[PDB]
Symmetry: C2
């Protein structure tokens, strides 16, 4: 759909699959750091809420 | 830091940890879809490239 249009532009641009894999893997790594952030956000609030409630 | 300002706001808003966890959980699932879409993008290009190189 949108992706066939993507593949045609990548192919026109002389991209090989190896090249696309290395760039997309870096994107994927950045995405996965967002999961880590939402976890840290949650645990931080869990601790904050608990600390507020105690006092 | 930034987050601590969020926490004070969430706490003033009466959010509990259980409530935050479930809302963040659904958002987390959405982000997990992106990494998977990128893996699918890589895989679909490998197939498209491989097919184009057939001709």
């Amino acid at each position: 759909a949108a992706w066939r249009i993507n593949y045609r532009a990548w192919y026109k641009a002389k991209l090989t699959p190896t090249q696309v894999k290395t760039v997309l893997g870096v994107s994927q790594a950045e995405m996965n750091n967002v999961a880590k952030q939402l976890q840290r956000l949650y645990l931080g609030y869990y601790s904050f809420y608990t600390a507020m409630e105690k006092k």
